[PDB]
Structure 1
Amino acid sequence: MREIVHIQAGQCGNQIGAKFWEVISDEHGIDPTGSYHGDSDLQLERINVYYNEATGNKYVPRAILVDLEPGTMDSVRSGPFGQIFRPDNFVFGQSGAGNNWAKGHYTEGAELVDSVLDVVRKESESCDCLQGFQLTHSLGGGTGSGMGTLLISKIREEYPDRIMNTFSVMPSPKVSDTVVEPYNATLSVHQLVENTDETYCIDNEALYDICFRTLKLTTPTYGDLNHLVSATMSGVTTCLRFPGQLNADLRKLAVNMVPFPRLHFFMPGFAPLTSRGSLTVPELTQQMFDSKNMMAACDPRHGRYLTVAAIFRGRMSMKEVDEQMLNVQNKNSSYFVEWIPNNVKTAVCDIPPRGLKMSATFIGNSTAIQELFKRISEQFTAMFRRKAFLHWYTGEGMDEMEFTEAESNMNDLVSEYQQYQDATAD
């Protein structure tokens, strides 16, 4: 289990995707031209997981860039690491989706899906032992949401034995007050429950709340939100990219984190939280398990953890981490299920991220994520009851029953979380 094929779709998907590549290239000693300028040998040991080795010892990301809007390719190209991407890997349509999930999934998006798959095949056939795929996208728009889910399903048919992992950005009216976003997110969640193995839930509501209330930023921008996203994506991919006392991969993460197939939506967390251009182990373990440090706007103290994986980065006593992690599980004992023994796993990585000596990343599978799904469901139902803008969807060949089916599946998902939150060992 080595290589991962990364796909980024739509505006949000490409913006957070570009930031991911900039952050991890800096960690691995890769410059914007593709050359290795690092000093530690630990940076190249598992470089093959995200990069293809090329002529003149040049490292090129195994990244495919997709969007129905052609203007997105230019913003990506104008970035610092915009020239590191392979020119054949850019697949861009002529007209966007205009926040219409039906255009992304059934009409414009369906015309461009065979072209993307051709590039995925070329990247996959050049892998010695492909682990699976990672997609970055928003659920509120039309391309990342509608076309992204179509791509996930088509990849699933061609590679059913490989892992499918998404970094999916959940909408919030605090960042984007577009009323059709709950429709697009609900239709997408219906697809993600069936077709992905693991989804990191990155919530624009929590991202905005952290910038505004914790970082004191009065008018948070996309750049401020994406700083929290890139630190999180760096943290949760640490053990795929660095050796460590574990040989982690996407399938071992799934087998140990997902006890029920539909319950594969993770709540990521990060400590310390910092703003752009701006710590002890017990403090890190504390902050890590605090609602203010979660990237999904849910209070973990309102539910129960089924499973947790934590990654500490930097130089610290491995015995101290074991002691503090043991302490948090004893004093917060009622917030963990009793019927999954030893459900908390820790890893320590020597290399910390940029600008920090200490950092902790949290990956929780908690029943409290039902609060995120209920927030979107209540907004979907408010719009859907009045049939507001429904013609924008049905006019692209969508049946009205697709909405009822997505709503019913999401409410079923919420009920499933509640069932295990109330389950006891006896």
Structure 2
Amino acid sequence: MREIVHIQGGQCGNQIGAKFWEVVSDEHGIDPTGTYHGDSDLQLERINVYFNEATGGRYVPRAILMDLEPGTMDSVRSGPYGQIFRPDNFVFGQTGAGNNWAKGHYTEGAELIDSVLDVVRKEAESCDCLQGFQVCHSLGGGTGSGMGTLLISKIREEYPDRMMLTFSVVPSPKVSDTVVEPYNATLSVHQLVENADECMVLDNEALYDICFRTLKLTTPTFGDLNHLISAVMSGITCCLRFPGQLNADLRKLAVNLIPFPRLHFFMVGFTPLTSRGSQQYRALTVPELTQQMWDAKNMMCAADPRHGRYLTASALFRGRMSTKEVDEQMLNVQNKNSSYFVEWIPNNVKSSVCDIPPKGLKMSATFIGNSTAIQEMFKRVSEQFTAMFRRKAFLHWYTGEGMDEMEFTEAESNMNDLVSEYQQYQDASAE
């Protein structure tokens, strides 16, 4: 009975959440109408973690979809598995920030942040025993990045003893959607360090590289990318919703992973990704999942984890599995390359086993990793941030809605602090 509040913000956040609630639905076996039609009794045992009871057996999600433009919300409402949401939970604005952090956080934020806390407070008070908040958004944008950093800021002041899972996508080196991606991410990262509790860094071309080499998809649309995002997010909550041999809540993963309060940027991956032409050749064994687990190619972050050391890693196995080959292989991967693991945190790898697998898969795993190799991303975003700020290009808006350049000078102050934090943590050694 540890429920999780879900909030979707931005174009990327709402599109991910639209696919996310499809993956939660068929795991618990509910139809697009809302009534239950699964064939397992264990699905209905824990539905308050993500859904709310309604009249006539209707199951309404704990989702608070919110955006400053109503265009993306129209697509999610009209789509399949989209009529399940409560229309009261679709808090929205009309003017739209339009890829501006200052508009999404200061001007257009003020008229909406009073309304979105009222919807969350109504939902959070109704449910009994809160565990955390699951927010999904982008960082390069302005509609969900600057607004999402505002909503996390107010929800920490209101519920300071509860978790926040922030599944956020980041700017990319290879291909960039918007010109103002370095400006919007640097301001957003400054608010995610002080406020958020766990941060799951996702990256677009890592999703594209997985869809090309592993899944062998010729034309990977955004739905193929968003199904990979929801593969992790279903696996994080798998112990709350389904019984298992090693039960691990959000707070279990939180206290096991972060040794210090600021170093809470993670990187995730889903293990059994095989192309349709290679299903019969592959054997679904425990060492096969682990070999794909620690591969850098399977990692959904742009940062190469060979360049850095894992401070702490988490694995969430699901399915009918033996605890022998689970933890022995975690011992085996630590002994194979001990140089890639932090020495002063002994026994880095933490594992949990859940009895009920995801739908269709015999067994699966979700791999959270708190590695210091993520500094290559924060250095890279700070590199493009200092490239434009010296010439003061694309700046006359942010200083127009009242966010001074002192907020920029403080931006790379903490942006370069946390990339200096991760570097010296890797260099330090015991004794």
Flag whether TM exceeds 0.5 (same fold).
Answer: yes
Q: Does 1:316 align with 2:321?
A: yes
Map Cα deviations across residues 200-228 of structure 1 (whole Å, 9 max, x no partner).
Answer: 11112322332344445565432232122
In structure 1, what is the equivalent of residue 171 of structure 2?
171
2:404 aligns with one of 399, 405, 410 = 399
1:239 deviation in Å?
A: 1.9
Per-residue CA deviation, residues 321-373 of structure 1 (Å, 9 max, x unaligned), is 22222211110222222222333211122322234223221001111111111
Q: Does 1:25 align with 2:9?
A: no
Which position in structure 1 is the counterpart of 2:207? 207
Instruction: Tell me which residue corresponds to 1:260.
Output: 260
Distance (whole Å) between structure 1 residues aligned to residue 220 and residue 81 of structure 2: 24
Aligned residues between the structures: 426
Runs of at least 5 residues in structure 1 that lack an aligned partner in the other structure: none
| Alignment partner, residue 312 of structure 2 | 307
> What's the secondary structure of 1:3's corresponding residue?
strand
Match of 1:416 in 2: 421
Q: Identity across aligned pairs (percent)?
A: 89
For residue 107 of structure 1, what is the aligned residue in structure 2?
107
Alpha-carbon deviation of 1:262?
A: 0.7
Q: Give the counterpart letter for 2:112 in structure 1.
A: L
CA contact (8 A) 1:45 1:243 kept: no
1:2 aligned onto 2:2: yes
State the 1:251 CA deviation.
2.2
SS in 2 for 1:56: helix
Q: Which residue of 2 aligns with 1:238?
A: 238
Matched, 1:357 2:362: yes
Q: Which amino acid aligns with 1:285?
A: T
* 1:224-280 deviation line (CA, Å, top 9, x unaligned): 321221222222222232121344322222121111111001111111225699922
Aligned counterpart, 2:34: 34
Cα deviation per residue 1:254-312 (whole Å; 9 max; x = unaligned)?
Answer: 12111111100111111122569992211211110011011111121211111111012
Q: Structure 1: how far apart are the matches of 2:179 and 2:345?
A: 40
Query: What's the counterpart of residue 386 of structure 1?
Result: 391
Paired AA for residue 272 in structure 1? P
Structure 1 residue aligned with 2:94: 94
CA distance in 2, matches of 1:69, 1:10: 9
Map residues 334-345 of structure 1 onto 2, 5 A cutoff: 334-345=339-350
Identify the residue that residue 141 of structure 2 maps to in structure 1: 141
The TM-score, its normalising length taken from structure 2, stands at: 0.94
- Residue 249 of structure 1: aligned partner: 249
8 A Cα contact 1:296 1:372, kept in partner: no
Q: Is the 8 A contact 2:168 2:199 kept in 1?
A: yes
2:56 partner letter: G
**Structure 1 residue aligned with 2:382, among 377, 380, 385?**
377
Segments of structure 2 that go 5 or more residues without pairing to the other structure are: none
Q: Give the partner amino acid of 1:131.
A: Q
Q: Which residue of 2 aligns with 1:292?
A: 297
Structure 2 equivalent of residue 332 of structure 1: 337
Assess if the C-alpha contact under 8 Å between 1:46 and 1:243 holds in 2.
Answer: no
Which range moves more in the overlay, 407-416 or 169-178? 169-178
Q: Aligned equivalents of 1:297 and 1:274: distance in 2?
A: 20
Q: Which amino acid aligns with 1:236?
A: I
Note if contact 2:149-2:192 (Cα within 8 Å) is conserved in structure 1: yes
Tell me which moved more, 24-33 or 231-240.
231-240
Once the 2 structures are TM-superposed, how far is the Cα of residue 173 of structure 1 from its aligned partner?
A: 5.6
Cα offsets for 1:2-41 (capped at 9, x unmatched): 1111110111111101111110110011211221212222
For the 8 Å contact 1:136–1:166, the answer to whether it is kept is: yes
Structure-2 separation of matches of 1:216 and 1:38: 31
Query: How far off is 1:98 after superposition?
Result: 1.4
**C-alpha distance in 2 between matches for 1:220 and 1:174:** 17
Residue 353 of structure 1 aligns with an amino acid whose one-letter code is: P
Query: How far off its partner does 1:196 sit?
Result: 0.4
